[PDB]
Design a protein around this nucleic acid. Sequence first.
RNA 1: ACUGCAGGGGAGACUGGAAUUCCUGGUGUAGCGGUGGAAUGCGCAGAUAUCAGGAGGAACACCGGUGGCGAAGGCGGGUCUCUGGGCAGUAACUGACGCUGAGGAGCGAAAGCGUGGGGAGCGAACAGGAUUAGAUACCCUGGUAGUCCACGCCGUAAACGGUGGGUACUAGGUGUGGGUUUCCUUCCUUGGGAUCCGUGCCGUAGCUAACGCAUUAAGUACCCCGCCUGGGGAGUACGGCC
RNA 2: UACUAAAAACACAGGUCCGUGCGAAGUCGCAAGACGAUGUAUACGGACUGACGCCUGCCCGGUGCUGGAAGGUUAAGAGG
Lengths: 272, 117, 95, 87, 63
Amino acid sequence: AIRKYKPTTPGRRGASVSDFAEITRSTPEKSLVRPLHGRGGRNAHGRITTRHKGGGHKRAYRMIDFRRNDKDGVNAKVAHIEYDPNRTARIALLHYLDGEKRYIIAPNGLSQGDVVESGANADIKPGNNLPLRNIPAGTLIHAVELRPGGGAKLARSAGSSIQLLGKEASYASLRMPSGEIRRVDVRCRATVGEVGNAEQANINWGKAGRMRWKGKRPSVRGVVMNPVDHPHGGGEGKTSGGRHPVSPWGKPEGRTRNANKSSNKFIVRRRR
Amino acid sequence: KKNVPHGAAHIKSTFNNTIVTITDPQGNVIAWASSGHVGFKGSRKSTPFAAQLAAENAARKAQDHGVRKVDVFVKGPGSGRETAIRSLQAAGLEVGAISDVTPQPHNGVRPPKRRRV
Amino acid sequence: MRPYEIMVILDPTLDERTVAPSLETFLNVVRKDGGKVEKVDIWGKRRLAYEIAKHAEGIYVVIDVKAAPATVSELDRQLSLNESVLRTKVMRTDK
Amino acid sequence: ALTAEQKKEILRSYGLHETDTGSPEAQIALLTKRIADLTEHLKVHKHDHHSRRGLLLLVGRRRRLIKYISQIDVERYRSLIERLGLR
Amino acid sequence: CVFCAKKDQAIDYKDTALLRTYISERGKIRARRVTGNCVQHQRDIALAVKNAREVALLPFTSS
RNA sequence: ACUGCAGGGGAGACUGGAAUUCCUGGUGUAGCGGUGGAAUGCGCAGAUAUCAGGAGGAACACCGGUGGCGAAGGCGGGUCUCUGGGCAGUAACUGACGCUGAGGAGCGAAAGCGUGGGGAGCGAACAGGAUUAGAUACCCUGGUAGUCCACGCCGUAAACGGUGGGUACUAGGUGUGGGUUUCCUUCCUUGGGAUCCGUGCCGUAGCUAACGCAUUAAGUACCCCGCCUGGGGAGUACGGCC
RNA sequence: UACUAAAAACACAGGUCCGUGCGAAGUCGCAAGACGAUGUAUACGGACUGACGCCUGCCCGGUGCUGGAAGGUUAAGAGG
Ligand SMILES: [Mg+2]
Ligand SMILES: [Mg+2]
Ligand SMILES: [Mg+2]
Ligand SMILES: [Mg+2]
Ligand SMILES: [Mg+2]
Ligand SMILES: [Mg+2]
Ligand SMILES: [Mg+2]
Ligand SMILES: [Mg+2]
Ligand SMILES: [Mg+2]
Ligand SMILES: [Mg+2]
Ligand SMILES: [Mg+2]
Ligand SMILES: [Mg+2]
Ligand SMILES: [Mg+2]
Ligand SMILES: [Mg+2]
Ligand SMILES: [Mg+2]
Ligand SMILES: [Mg+2]
Ligand SMILES: [Mg+2]
Ligand SMILES: [Mg+2]
Ligand SMILES: [Mg+2]
Ligand SMILES: [Mg+2]
Ligand SMILES: [Mg+2]
Ligand SMILES: [Mg+2]
Ligand SMILES: [Mg+2]
Ligand SMILES: [Mg+2]
Ligand SMILES: [Mg+2]
Ligand SMILES: [Mg+2]
Ligand SMILES: [Mg+2]
Ligand SMILES: [Mg+2]
Ligand SMILES: [Mg+2]
Ligand SMILES: [Mg+2]
Ligand SMILES: [Mg+2]
Ligand SMILES: [Mg+2]
Ligand SMILES: [Mg+2]
Ligand SMILES: [Mg+2]
Ligand SMILES: [Mg+2]
Ligand SMILES: [Mg+2]
Ligand SMILES: [Mg+2]
Ligand SMILES: [Mg+2]
Ligand SMILES: [Mg+2]
Ligand SMILES: [Mg+2]
Ligand SMILES: [Mg+2]
Ligand SMILES: [Mg+2]
Ligand SMILES: [Mg+2]
Ligand SMILES: [Mg+2]
Ligand SMILES: [Mg+2]
Ligand SMILES: [Mg+2]
Ligand SMILES: [Mg+2]
Ligand SMILES: [Zn+2]
């Protein structure tokens, strides 16, 4: 699962890395790859809108099939499990019996060579994609969509899962990875099972260089700035900031969710 | 301003109080007069006299609200059970069948530590 | 190759006349797997000792499958997956 | 496990005269079969200490029988060693 | 032990008519000394009662 | 070796009910909780109580015992899969292949440690109340780690039968458990008699300072290992291993 | 600290807290639009601390933040 480096250097002393034991076919599928380029956290104006971005290893995008709507009743065979630099889960390449190749998020327990079904008549097995109406309550699902046909949007990171609490009339109550209970329409599609690569959260990056490779740039604390730069700046020695904690633009801590967002009627219980 | 000719009576008799509530057969409370509700405080709320007078208060409130007969469910290792039953009987109400509904955990939640007084 | 005996409890909403064709597929999976079915006697509508899934009634079936353990496990998994099954219990006739 | 016919197969494979069951050769063969089965089972359920103790007991019994047969007949010892496995 | 006396007797969890005995009015499994059975048959009866309660042929808590 | 027998022996997976708590809604109003007595505390902004539904973790009443199993520690909600050991019977087979075991190795209650998850209830630490001259406690109200799961670590208990392992012999009486065996075989009795493996009590000889042990010896003998040479200092110092 | 300060200052891997259920929060912009991210709570943003080891005590009176609404006070509007 996780391989620990040996303390041969100070940079490697405590670090660890995935063993990549689940990976076959170390190259991607040429027909499902699109170009990508970095932004450095800059928007269309050319200005930094997200801080601490840039550098980073070059990447290529792999088209993930997040809809899974048009292959109902058509079986697929899992051909490979591949590394993806754009997400924390691994991806599985599917060979459809119709001759088409697709990429999906690899669920937990979807070894190469398995058969994957879709539609209302599919069996309840990891990797099978069904509308929520046909999934029994208490199941663990992932890659759920908010609107019918809108594409999977929830529970997509490594190790994520959603528990189908129940379907009442035309809505399904879901326990979402944050712990918030939500309702979505029963016609929304979901995939059975939990997302794989669940142990990646235990990886110990060893040095600053590794995060620079992953594209994360250094972050400077507010209390070591000058007051013209940050509200926490100033002071003779080191201070705690001369006030209650605030953002670099002076906003205090507290809830930032819009108080009367339209979706409030779909949320049963806020997270802890 | 209701009328419930038949209902249910619940008596919870513990070591520190005695609660006598009277509900309709669906369980909606009509009266709930207790030992503390009648004039009493401290450890006297668990006395048989307190329990029986609370039963009197509950019975008279039930008579006011329009109840003629109730079944009795009792629970708790209190000493006011029989006195409350007798008061409910000879205070203008009929009790009928007497049943014990004390919860019995099949070795569930761990009890608190024993007293070292 | 071991002798099993499975009792299935169905929802009262289903009628008692079409019960056999519904579980014929759950018997045929064992049949293909290489198992043999002894008797599929149906007890019909009965009262339960307590409410199950907010149902006071159910349909009782004794399947009595003699097949491989993996096949019986698959059959039990399918029965549990089916939403019309309320309760399922598998016990070995022998030791 | 070691069902009846499963035992009989090894008994006829490693026996002396068509009915032998208690000779060191047959005993060591059966113990080796049991040990292999137990170790393969123990690759699963790694916390089955109550059965690991039985496996250790079988290992000790087989070691003692191997020592006895080695002391009593070097040629038979070597034959059994090549037929079954050592180190 | 009535089962020891009358040999070749099937004890089954679905045999609810026979399993009605050895239980009290509140659903309480009767004591071995009260029933007069031996240890093995008492254990078998208890197991059958538990399986029957699990498959809802007998009530867990009777009131 | 073959045929039978009993079992909470162990591991994994799925699953059930009771109960507590919590959430939502209905009924409903002024108390609830707690003690030897109280107060801290909770409710009046709708509490306790009652009903219905849902969420969640822990533990499995009755069976249940003086019982069973396991080398010890320990072991029962149910089902399935895998697996260990023991006992009985035939004597089917080998033919002293046996006993103990320095070091060494493995297992090993609870508490505790590392990593991730989980947390209903209980509950060190901590806080408030109460008792008291004082109360860093006993009592009450709360409440964190922990108790739970996964993989590791730790290897310590009054880990006790305060009794090392194996064998042979040494009156009986009376319960229980697993077998087998003829007879009394219907005296239905599943009783009595014979044998094997255990588990209790009482009791002969013998031993003991006494208490007591007494076929499950602390009796009579043999083989092997471990341990003691007055009480503190001290199972502590130094050194060494983990 | 281009041109008197190279350090004990900054960064850092690791840690905790807070926010964000998804054209999310946050940021640029009057807006459309964009970045966040062709990402989805094992993710992203903000704050403080700063490998590792042992630990992280008491105080919620003040001020913030979060939640509640019985009562007091309180704008425009209504009323006249
Ligand atoms: Mg421009
Ligand atoms: Mg950042
Ligand atoms: Mg920094
Ligand atoms: Mg400065
Ligand atoms: Mg500037
Ligand atoms: Mg400023
Ligand atoms: Mg400063
Ligand atoms: Mg200073
Ligand atoms: Mg600070
Ligand atoms: Mg400042
Ligand atoms: Mg486990
Ligand atoms: Mg809760
Ligand atoms: Mg309420
Ligand atoms: Mg309530
Ligand atoms: Mg011979
Ligand atoms: Mg030895
Ligand atoms: Mg040794
Ligand atoms: Mg522990
Ligand atoms: Mg721990
Ligand atoms: Mg933890
Ligand atoms: Mg205090
Ligand atoms: Mg306390
Ligand atoms: Mg408490
Ligand atoms: Mg600690
Ligand atoms: Mg260890
Ligand atoms: Mg002990
Ligand atoms: Mg000695
Ligand atoms: Mg001895
Ligand atoms: Mg001895
Ligand atoms: Mg005896
Ligand atoms: Mg004695
Ligand atoms: Mg002595
Ligand atoms: Mg020492
Ligand atoms: Mg030292
Ligand atoms: Mg300079
Ligand atoms: Mg210089
Ligand atoms: Mg320098
Ligand atoms: Mg600097
Ligand atoms: Mg926004
Ligand atoms: Mg968070
Ligand atoms: Mg902060
Ligand atoms: Mg600092
Ligand atoms: Mg940091
Ligand atoms: Mg304060
Ligand atoms: Mg404050
Ligand atoms: Mg306050
Ligand atoms: Mg406020
Ligand atoms: Zn019997």
